[PDB]
């Protein structure tokens, strides 16, 4: 009657926060991309033709992107998925050979590119092979007549040649939750990734997420809603990288304007090395273009979003990177299979006070790659035939502040980053994982029988 008992309840809407192993999803059309396992999607589960999403009313959940384990689970996936792809391919350890390199045939006006002859092996264990290839200077280092050279990795890390069949192209991946767990999508427009979320809905799977591997600039990514949102785990800490989300995409046109020959060299049985033959015709250097207008337009839309965090009237300056490896000092990205590195000094060379043509970015291509920096193991990307071209929506940024210096006069900012987790945060800010507690116990006037 009036006194209270206990009564069990199965299936109550109750969840607790916990982490658990998730799994992927990448449609069924990207499954048809095949071409001998392009990049990732293989056992990737198909997507619900109706990605059902359930809004949750009077539900206020506390989201964090900077601590979201989903970033680490994904981060370790891209890495391990990459080694599986590297394993079946050709080990280029026989390439660690003294190289007779000559500068490239141009009418003065100086090379970056070396016409390197060298002895190789054949499928016959005794017969050897006097061959030559071309290499960018970043892949070789001279070793002390004309100068002999060797691959920059050969002295630290073993090297393997990426399978020419696998493609490095990104594919939208939907991360998914098993039964007993579900995913929470923070939907409010102006949301700094930290703190609770007003509008909370649940999905069983994130949206299509392309694992773009790029430094400084973010490409092909998610855009912000209304104002451009600026998220950093901590801004007082200048050391904490600052992640930016656009409301509008910035176009960029990147090329390798060089028609490329590719020689396949027989070191077998079964082992074959893809060298570079001649460039066909004019030698031009890789570059990217950006509409100087829309670019400078986006610089201002941002700088007006910054004074929201620093002064009503103040000065804002942009500088190029202070220092680091090539991956950080310049803009790393894979365009068309080759790996580009573009001088962004011309993008970050500006100053801002309280109140038609296009830029062009000199780019550099490397083939021997140690991405994720893991010594002992390097990947040699084979060359891509013909002229390369690709175009991307610039959709975010990774930036670092400066130091105490002068107090309040002005603050400087530069590109940065290089940790691909931050590339993943750009998409998982609005996501987090929870486990259910469906058993409910509560008092009431009910009692079972005798």
């Amino acid at each position: 009657a009036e006194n209270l008992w206990v009564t069990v309840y199965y299936g109550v809407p109750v969840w607790k926060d916990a982490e658990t192993t998730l799994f992927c999803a990448s449609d069924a059309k990207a499954y048809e991309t095949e071409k001998h396992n392009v990049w990732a999607t293989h056992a990737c589960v198909p997507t619900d033709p109706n990605p059902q999403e359930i809004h949750l009313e009077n539900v206020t959940e506390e989201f964090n992107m900077w601590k979201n384990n989903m970033v680490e689970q994904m981060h370790t996936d891209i890495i391990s998925l990459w080694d599986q792809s590297l394993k079946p391919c050709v080990k280029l350890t026989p390439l660690c050979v003294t190289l007779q390199c000559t500068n490239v045939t141009n009418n003065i006006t100086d090379g970056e590119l070396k016409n390197c002859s060298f002895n190789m092996t054949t499928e016959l264990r005794d017969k050897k092979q006097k061959v030559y290839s071309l290499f960018y200077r970043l892949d070789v280092v001279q070793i002390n007549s004309n100068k002999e050279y060797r691959l920059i990795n050969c002295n630290t890390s073993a090297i393997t040649q990426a399978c020419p069949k696998v493609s490095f192209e990104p594919i939208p991946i939907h991360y998914c939750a098993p039964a007993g767990f579900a995913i929470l999508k923070c939907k409010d427009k102006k949301f700094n990734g930290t703190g609770p979320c007003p509008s909370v809905s649940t999905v069983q799977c994130t949206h299509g997420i392309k694992p773009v591997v790029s430094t400084q600039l973010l490409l092909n990514g998610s855009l912000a809603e209304e104002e451009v949102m600026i998220r950093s785990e901590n801004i007082t800490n200048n050391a904490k990288n600052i992640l930016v989300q656009f409301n509008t995409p910035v176009q960029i046109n990147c090329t390798r304007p060089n028609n490329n020959t590719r020689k396949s060299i027989r070191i077998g049985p079964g082992q074959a090395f893809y060298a570079t033959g001649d460039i066909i015709g004019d030698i031009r250097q890789a570059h990217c273009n950006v509409s100087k207008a829309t670019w400078n337009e986006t610089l201002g839309k941002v700088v007006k979003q910054l004074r929201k965090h620093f002064g009503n009237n103040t000065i804002i300056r942009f500088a190029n990177s202070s220092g680091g490896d090539l991956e950080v000092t310049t803009h790393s990205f894979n365009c068309g299979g080759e790996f580009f590195y573009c001088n962004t000094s011309g993008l970050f060379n500006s100053t801002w006070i309280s109140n038609n043509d296009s830029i062009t970015l000199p780019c550099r291509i490397k083939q021997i790659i140690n991405m994720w920096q893991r010594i002992g193991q390097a990947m040699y990307a084979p060359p891509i035939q013909g002229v390369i071209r690709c175009v991307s929506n610039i959709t975010g940024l990774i930036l670092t502040r400066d130091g105490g210096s002068t107090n309040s006069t002005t603050e400087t900012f530069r590109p940065g980053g290089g940790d691909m987790r931050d590339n993943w945060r750009s998409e998982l800010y609005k996501y987090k994982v929870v486990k259910i507690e469906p058993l409910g116990v509560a008092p009431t006037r009910c009692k079972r029988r005798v």
């Binding site: 006194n3 209270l4 008992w5 206990v6 009564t7 069990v8 309840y9 199965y10 299936g11 109550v12 809407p13 109750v14 969840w15 658990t20 192993t21 998730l22 799994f23 992927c24 293989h42 056992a43 990737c44 589960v45 059902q52 359930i54 949750l56 009313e57 009077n58 539900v59 206020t60 996936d77 391990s80 998925l81 599986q84 098993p178 039964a179 007993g180 579900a182 649940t202 486990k435 259910i436 507690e437 469906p438 058993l439 409910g440 116990v441 509560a442 008092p443 009431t444 009910c446 009692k447 079972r448």
Partner: protein, 126 residues
């Protein structure tokens, strides 16, 4: 009215009892990187069954709702019926009781089915 899965989360607890058939329904859902999904779907049944055990070792096993002869200590969030179901959601509610939950279950499993079901035999033996 079908608000979908977990629709009644921000609903008061009384409104959420309409949805037990929804949250309990999809609680199960019928090389390298294949591992990723495999160990995942196993935790679903490891998770689901541990309740069936709790639900089972108590006077229930019959899913959704089920009552019990265990009383309610006022030392566990002494409240009025309306102050709970009508004014609280489950999250607000489950947030409080999480202290004595383990103390609660030790009754339902031991004081009840361990004791009450034997009395049934003592009554049914004649």
């Amino acid at each position: 009215v079908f608000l979908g899965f977990l629709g009644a989360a921000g609903s008061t607890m009384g409104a959420a009892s309409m949805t037990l058939t929804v949250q309990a329904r999809n609680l199960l859902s019928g090389t390298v990187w294949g591992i990723k999904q495999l160990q995942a779907r196993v935790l679903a049944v490891e998770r689901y069954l541990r309740d069936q055990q709790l639900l089972g070792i108590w006077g229930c096993s019959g899913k959704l709702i089920c009552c019990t002869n265990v009383p309610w200590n006022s030392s566990w969030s002494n409240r009025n019926l309306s102050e709970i179901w009508d004014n609280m959601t489950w999250l607000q509610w489950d947030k409080e009781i999480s202290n004595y939950t383990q103390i609660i279950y030790g009754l339902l499993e031991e004081s009840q089915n361990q004791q009450e079901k034997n009395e049934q035999d003592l009554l049914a033996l004649d």
